[PDB]
Each structure stands twice: as C-alpha cells, then as structure tokens.
Amino acid sequence: AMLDPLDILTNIDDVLPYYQAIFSAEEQKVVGYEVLGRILADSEIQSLGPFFLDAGIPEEYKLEVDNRIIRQALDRFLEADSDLLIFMNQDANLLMLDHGESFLELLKEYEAKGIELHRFVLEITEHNFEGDIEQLYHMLAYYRTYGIKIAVDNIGKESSNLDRIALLSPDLLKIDLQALKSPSYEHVLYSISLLARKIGAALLYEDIEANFQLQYAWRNGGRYFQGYYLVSPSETFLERDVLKQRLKTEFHQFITHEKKKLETVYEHSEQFYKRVHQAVTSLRKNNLSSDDDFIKKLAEELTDCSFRIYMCDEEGDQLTGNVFKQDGEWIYQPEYAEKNWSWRPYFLENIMRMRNLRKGFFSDLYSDLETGEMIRTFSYPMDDQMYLFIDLPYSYL
Amino acid sequence: LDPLDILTNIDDVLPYYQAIFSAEEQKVVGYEVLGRILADSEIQSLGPFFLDAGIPEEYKLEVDNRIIRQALDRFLEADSDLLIFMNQDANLLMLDHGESFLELLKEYEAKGIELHRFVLEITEHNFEGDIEQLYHMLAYYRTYGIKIAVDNIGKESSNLDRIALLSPDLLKIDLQALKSPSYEHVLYSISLLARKIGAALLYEDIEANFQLQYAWRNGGRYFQGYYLVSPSETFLERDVLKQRLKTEFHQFITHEKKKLETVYEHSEQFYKRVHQAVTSLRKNNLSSDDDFIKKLAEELTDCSFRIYMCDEEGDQLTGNVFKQDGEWIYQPEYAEKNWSWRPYFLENIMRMRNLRKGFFSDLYSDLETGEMIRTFSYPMDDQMYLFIDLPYSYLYEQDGLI
C-alpha cells in the first residue's frame, strides 16, 4: 500500500526537497525554511518521513538519500535571498559516525559557494542521542565557532531531559502543541519560555494548525512560527511578505486581548484595595489590641469574597491565627500563628516593595498550598512594621 | 554482601529512618523509611541489593515487605500526624498494578494509619513499562488520599510536560549535583511550574551550609540530609532542631534583605541618571527620536550597549543604536519590528504607565551578543517607552547586580 525502502533506493533520481516557511513575530515575515524529504512516485509526491525514521534500513543508504536532498536544497538557496535561515534535520547518531566532519565539509563547501554558515539551523533531538553529552557538546560547540546554529526538537516527548538540553546551550527550542490539541499545559509553556529567556534560546512553535494554537504560541514567548495554519510545504519559495497582512492583524488582536486582560486585573486590584482600605481604617478605630481580634472582624466586613486572612511581621513570622472561610462562614485557626514564610518565592521581595510603594497589591495566580485551588494573595502594609495578607479564590467569572 | 547472606538472614533486616524538616515551623514532619541489615555486628545498606539486576523480584519484594511492615509498626506508636516517605521502585510496583502494595497500605489503614499520611516516592528514570500506565495507577492511588512525590527532579528526571500531567504533591530535588550555570536555570523554571500546579519542593541530600541556603532561597518547603540529621533507628524529638534552624534562617533572611535592597537602590540611582539625561537632552530641543537616542547613547556610553524606543503596543519607533567594540552604531532596520511577544513586555508597559517610574529587568541572556545582561525601562511623554540594555561589563563592576 505505502512506500517500500526498495521503491526509494531504486528511484533515487526522483527524490526532491520540499520547503516550509517559518514566520517571525517581529516582522511577521518569512525568516527561513525547513527542508523536507520528498519523492515523486507514481505521479504522486509523497513523504520520505517514515523512510528516515525506519530502523530496518541500512544507514549507508540513508546518507546517500539525504545527501541528494540537501545538495538540491542548498542549490535552491544559492539563487535566493542571502539572509534566509536554513532549517535542516540531522540525526546526531548518524552524524557522529565521523564526528560530523563530512557534514561540516559539505556546509564548508557551501560557504565558499555563497552561504554564510550562521544561516544553518541544525535541528536535533537530544533524547535520541546515545553516547556522552560532553562528546556531542564539544562537536556542536566547534560547530558554533563558525556561527552554525543548533536547534533542539521534540522538547518533552519521550526521554527529553531539560538538564542535557540546557548544557547543549541551544540557539533554538522547537515546541509542538500536540498535547494541547485541558487546563495545566499553559504553565508548561510559561515555564519553558522563561527558561529559554534565561539560557538565551529562541522559541519556534511548530505544527500550528488552528488559530488558538497561534495565540498560545504568541503569548508564551514564541519568536518563530510554523504549521498548516500559516503555510503547508511546497517546492517553491514564497514571497517574503505573503502573510504580512494576515499576521499583522492577527497579532494586533492578540496584543489587544492581552492588554485588556491586564486592565481588568489592575482595575479589580484598585477596586479591591479600596474595599480593604475602608475596612482597615474604619475598624482600627475600635478596641482590637490583640491583632487576632481585627482579623475576625475584617473577614466579616468584606463582601463574602475573602478566603483566608492573616498578619505577618517583616521577617515572615505569622503572629496571627488564620480566619479560613468555608461554606460562607468563619473559622478561627490559632495553630498557624507561629510560622515563617520567608522561604516562599516572592515573599521578602513584597515586604521590601511595600516599604517603597506604601500600597497593597495582588500576587499572580498560584495554587493554594492546602486546598489546591487557584488563588491570588493581597498584601497590605499596616502601621508599625506589619503586613496584612488576604488569600482570594479563582474569580472564575 | 551476597544476596544469599541477606535472604537467609531475613530476620536481621530492619528499617532505619531519616527526619524531614518543616520550613514554617522548624520541625520534623515525617521520616523517610530506609532499608538496613545487621550483618557481622554492623548496620549495612540494602541499596546495593535493591539495585542488583540478577536478583528476581520475588526476592526483592520479600525483603521490601519485611522492612515496610516493621516500619509501619513503629509509626503506629509515634505521633499520629507524621508523614511516611517510602521510596518504591516503579517496576516492582507495576508488576501487579500496585494492587498488593495498596492492599498492604489498607491493612494499616485498618490499624489506624490514615492513608493521607503516606508519601509514595516514584522514580520514573528507571521505568521500562508503559508510562501512561504508571500514571493511571498513580492517579488511582490518589483517590485514597495518598500523597505522591516524584524523585530526581532537575537532573535525570527533568521533563515539564510530565510533571504537569501527573501534577504530583511533591517534587524531590537532589543537591549533590550543585557541588548561574545551566543547572540553576533548570531548577528555577521547575520551581515556577511547581508554584503554579501546587507541588511542594523537597530538597534532599543537604550535606553543607550553601545547600541549605540554596534550598531555602529557592522555594524549599521541606529539607533532608546529613547536614540536618543523619539516619538513625529511632524517632527524634519533634523540636530536635528548631533552634539551630530558627537562627540559621535569620542569617539567610538578613543576607537576602541586604541583597534585595542593593539591587533596588541601584535601580533608583540609575533612574535618576537617566531622568537627568532625557529631560536635559529633550528640553528645548527640536530634533527627532532617532537623533535623540544617538545623543543619549553617548551620554550613557559607559553603562549601555543598546538603546531603542517603542509605543504602547510594542512597535519600535526608532532604529537601534548599538555599541560594538567601543564605538556606537546605528541600525535603522530595527524600526517597525514588534516586541510584544517577549515575556513581561506588555506587563512592563502596564507597570510603567501606572507607577510612572522606570526599572531594571532581572538577569537574562541577550540573544545577539550571548551574554547575561539587564534592560532598563523608562517611561517618557506621549506614551513612548525607552529601553536601555546594560552590558555584562558594567553589571559585574557594580555591587550586587549579578
């Protein structure tokens, strides 16, 4: 039914490369192309994808096929726009058979012909590589001295290891959104983008098929985009501005969606600090020496929109019980009035921030330690080196 | 030790324990259950035995069962709120889909140990089986209130997609490896994801001061190691270490307070320098934006290497001015590029437009130059925004900006 190894090795002259355009967030333009293996068989252009991913095929015959596709690709690039990036898949297991010399030579051959080496983006999967990371790293680090870029593919799929990835110090991380097709996957992208920001790697999102995938990509550090939604593979290079208009309008909308969401959260914060300021000022006029009193009085005076309320000093010591709210009613929890919270990620920073601003503010959304529901906590500066804290549920309106 | 010396002396086998410490109170919250054998009048590890590949599972399970039962017996005497950390081999566990082990757990549920006190530590590094099959029985175990800890995070088992899918109650981070480089960045991203999904961090193998320091500054909720308390055969007083930890953390707090304010102070003094420069250069001067930054660059020559301006939506209003090998250059092509996809970009505009002050970004890697930098963001008139990138050569000669 489908292609046989022998169908390809017999018809090696029919083999050709295809190209898929990669687009940028910056200029919403064609930044480069991925070179893909193809074959014209029985009046049909079909994929060499499985052929290269088949372990039954002797490796020497693979190189001879890949060699032809690459030489054609790079010939196409010679007579095109000289700043285009060239995205190529290479098997690191196959590449190591000679320490990547013949491949580097091939690339070195094209530099002399007219292609700067820094245009080459070499796509690789670290979890398919057997043998020492240190041995591979030095090769790629030697590769890097010529400006050859290293992309790492299929992040977090089978034996994917963030530590071995970070060490390879890649120029580019390739992310597919297949495990998105579901609440928790956006935190994964969020953490990845921040990691990539620290280690100095750009994010390319691939296999973008629908509009929501492009949005998720754009709002999680995506610098480069690829997929059917943008452009399918073809044997011809496209105009560099094909999708400029489409994408310019689509990004403006993302920008606008994101700005509004920030306005809302800020608006609700200012309109919450108001409710808390009035209550704090109106009740700190009455007998509540022990701070434990004030809390259970404050919890009642908020519009049934609290959760947990407690006070701390500048070194994170809780000198107040908890006033937990379950089923729209109070609970007093003296037990917690002896804990240190300086270990919590942003705690100390906030205390400091509150002595400068002299204003309250919300944290970002995070999972509540005891319940597990998404919350924000409002921090309020009290008189005499003290700080009020208010845990606050979803707002899943 | 021969596996035969262990198997025929199955009676000498015993559990040991290592305390795990709370961050809030500085007290013991549980004990990891460790396997030992008294052989030739000396306590020895059973680790080199549970690792051995030529010993059939029949026999590993026989020993494991003896240890666990003795330990849960010991727990039945101690405090009713102590956590029980048991490191269980996923392959051994999955031989019967966890059935028998859960059966073992239910028996002690019948004797008065609430299932929510159990912390099942899993190591997915070793797993030969179907991975979503394991997560299936792990999700099932959770329906009884059992807590799930994932092991070797950051190093061998460092996959975000997988942590999130399981969403475990605990992440155990080993700190031997520490003895920022790549590793600290990986831990940092894991730390964030954990705050978002509700997994507490347990730092184990703490055997020095800088490791305890590290755990505490990096969201560590629980701590374990030689530095704190070595493994013994007996439970300790629950406040055994409260005083040593209480003061040792105060040093950490004061060192961090001092560290946070020095950065904050520098940002303040930086803002004043830039405010003078802009207002001075812009006041009574009729020249365009691109000409303005070229002049700003020269005024700030000693502390920057890139300067450019953008509007409310991230559109760059100017080309770049760029300092390459000590001489400023002008790159017009950067005009009209959009930066809104960068993390924090729209958030920062929001902050500037409401705070009406400028500020330093945190340390991040410059994509072009390849060095750790900081960017300074400044709000100007007419909803315009100024960005000044600082070179590593400037940061390192300032106190505390790395």
Q: Flag whether A232 is in a domain.
A: no
- CA end-to-end span of chain B, whole Å? 50
State the helix-helix crossing angle for A101-113 and A59-78, rounded to 10 degrees.
Answer: 20
**Same domain assignment for residues A348 and A372:** yes
B256 touches A at CB < 8 Å: yes
Q: Are residues A1 and A46 in the same domain?
A: yes
* C-alpha–C-alpha distance, residues B234 and B256, integer Å: 36
Distance CA A258, CA B340 (A): 10
Kindly list the distances between the CA atom of residue B195 and the CA atoms of A104, A319, A344, B167, B391, in Å, as whole numbers in the listed order.
Answer: 44, 24, 9, 11, 32
Of B257, B250, B194, B258, which Cα lies nearest the Cα of B26? B250
Instruction: Tell me if B230 is assigned to some domain.
Output: no
CATH code assigned at A41: 3.20.20.450
- Chain A residues touching residue B366 (CB < 8 angstroms): 200
Residue A168 and residue A196 in one domain: yes
Q: Answer whether A223 sits within 8 Å of B156, measured CB to CB.
A: no
- Residue B393 DSSP symbol: H
Regarding whether A215 and A261 lie in a shared domain, the answer is: no
Sign of the Cα pseudo-torsion (A140, A142, A145, A146, in order): negative
Is A370 inside any structural domain?
yes
Q: Which domain holds residue A353?
A: 289-397
- Number of structural domains, chain A? 3
Does residue B9 sit in the same domain as residue B51?
yes
The 3-state secondary structure of A25-86 reads CCCCCEEEEEEEEEEEECCEEEECHHHHCCCCCCHHHHHHHHHHHHHHHHHHHHCCCCCCEE
- Is B234 among the domain residues? no
- CB < 8 Å from B in window 327-386 of A: 338-345, 348-349, 352, 356, 365-369, 372
**B292 vs B308: CA distance, rounded Å:** 10
Q: Which residue has the tokens 């007579």?
A: A79
Nearby residues of A290 by Cβ (< 8 Å), 6 or more positions away: none
Query: Resolution of the coordinates in A?
Result: 2.6
Indicate if A172 and A71 belong to the same structural domain.
yes
d(CA A166, CA A195) in angstroms, rounded, equals 9
Contact B29, B83 (CB under 8 A): yes
| Type of residue numbered A28 | Q
| Cα atoms in the Cβ-side hemisphere of radius 13 Å centred on B258 | 7
Same domain? For B102 and B138 the reply is yes
Q: Find tokens 């403006």 and name the residue.
A: A252
Does residue B236 lie in a domain region?
no
- Does the CB of B195 have a partner CB in chain A at under 8 Å? yes
CA-CA distance, B307 to B304, in Å (whole number)?
8
CB atoms within 10 A of CB A182: 7
Query: Comparing C-alpha atoms, which of B239, B228, B221, B237 is closest to residue B27?
Result: B239
B221 contacts on A by Cβ (under 8 Å):
343
Closest-approach residue (CA) in chain B for A223? B341
Mutate to test the interface with B, among A121, A162, A174 (most CBs of B within 10 A): A162
Residue A51: inside a domain: yes
Q: Which of B174, B197, B224 is the last residue of a domain?
A: B224
Would A231 be classed as within a structural domain? no
Helices then strands, each counted (H, E), chain B: 13, 16
Angstrom CA distances, B130 to A36, A205, B90, B127, B135, stand at: 31, 28, 11, 8, 9
Closest CA relative to residue A196, chosen from A170, A214, A219: A170
Tell me how far apart the alpha carbons of residues A168 and B349 are, in angstroms, rounded to a whole number. Answer: 34
CATH number at residue B282: 1.20.5.170
B206 and B72 fall within a common domain: yes
Residue B123: what residue type? Answer: T
Give B-chain residues touching A356 at CB under 8 angstroms: 264
Given B257, B286, B315, the domain boundary residue is B286
| B351 falls within a domain | yes
Check whether residue B272 and residue B292 sit in a common domain.
Answer: no
| Short-list B198, B238, B245, B204, CA closest to B223 | B204
Number of residues in chain B: 402
